[PDB]
């Protein structure tokens, strides 16, 4: 499965005030038709000017994207704080829940490793089978930095 | 509270048959969709056979389609991989995972000798 320049671009835009609205805050990526290609999924993204917009909570509105029966992969650019630092940093995320149908689940499951190794310099990972995971922000927050972090996304934990 | 825990690797001669098992605990094999992968050194991982939560329908890669099954024990929480008709080719750790969950074992060696 070969990864698609879009989604090389995408990444590395991640890594003026109308340029950065334009910025992506959350990406949904996908298999090409052929099964042979990871590419942006259309339309399934928020831009940073989106967000008090139409968004209001970004990563709520991220996990409404993610379909119910079938294998995602998403970059986040997540916010959270310690006691004495405020980061952000992205999320590389594996969705796979388990009513998405094997076949294309297990080219998801086999081709990680290789998109991965594209986003390179990318520190953090969340893999989700079921929506009480990726819905877990104390999940998020510890795969962020672990039992320090207290906060996310602008919310207290 | 999650183990993967494979065994039942060894040194076998090509042509050979080897079944590996994994006893899981922390969470019930039938309710996760469960693979095999193999790593040999310097390599990426080769994803090889995985079988569906609930159902139990199979995926197996090219590359061991018609020689390897893989299958469950619910009572017993365990998953397995039935290996006939082995080859050189076939020598690496062998891991049995969560597909959706970082979490992976220590694996078990196979080892074939032509």
């Known amino acids: ?157 | 509270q999650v183990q993967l825990v494979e065994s039942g690797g060894g040194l076998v001669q090509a042509g050979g048959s080897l079944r590996l098992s994994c006893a899981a605990s922390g969470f019930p094999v039938n309710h996760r969709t469960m693979a095999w992968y193999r790593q040999a050194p310097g390599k990426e991982r080769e994803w090889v056979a995985a079988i569906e939560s609930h159902g139990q329908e199979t995926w197996y890669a090219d590359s061991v389609k018609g020689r390897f099954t893989i299958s469950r024990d619910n009572a017993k929480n365990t998953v397995y991989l039935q290996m006939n008709s082995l080859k050189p080719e076939d020598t690496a750790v062998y891991y049995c995972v969560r597909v959706g969950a970082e979490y992976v074992g220590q694996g078990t060696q196979v080892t074939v000798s032509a």
């Open chain 1, 1 to 157: 499965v070969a990864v698609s320049d879009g989604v090389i671009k995408v990444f590395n835009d991640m890594k003026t005030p109308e340029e950065v609205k334009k910025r992506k805050k959350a990406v949904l990526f996908c298999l090409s038709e052929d099964k042979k290609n990871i590419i942006l999924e259309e339309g399934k993204e928020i831009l940073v000017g989106d967000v008090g917009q139409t968004v209001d909570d970004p990563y709520a509105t991220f996990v409404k994207m993610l379909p119910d029966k079938d294998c995602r992969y998403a970059l986040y650019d997540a916010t959270y704080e310690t006691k004495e630092s405020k980061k952000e940093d992205l999320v590389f995320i594996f969705w796979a829940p388990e009513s998405a149908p094997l076949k294309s689940k297990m080219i998801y499951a086999s081709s990680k490793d290789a998109i991965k190794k594209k986003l390179t310099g990318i520190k953090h990972e969340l893999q989700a089978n079921c929506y009480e995971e990726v819905k877990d922000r104390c999940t998020l927050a510890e795969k962020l930095g672990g039992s320090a972090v207290i906060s996310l996304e602008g919310k207290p934990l």
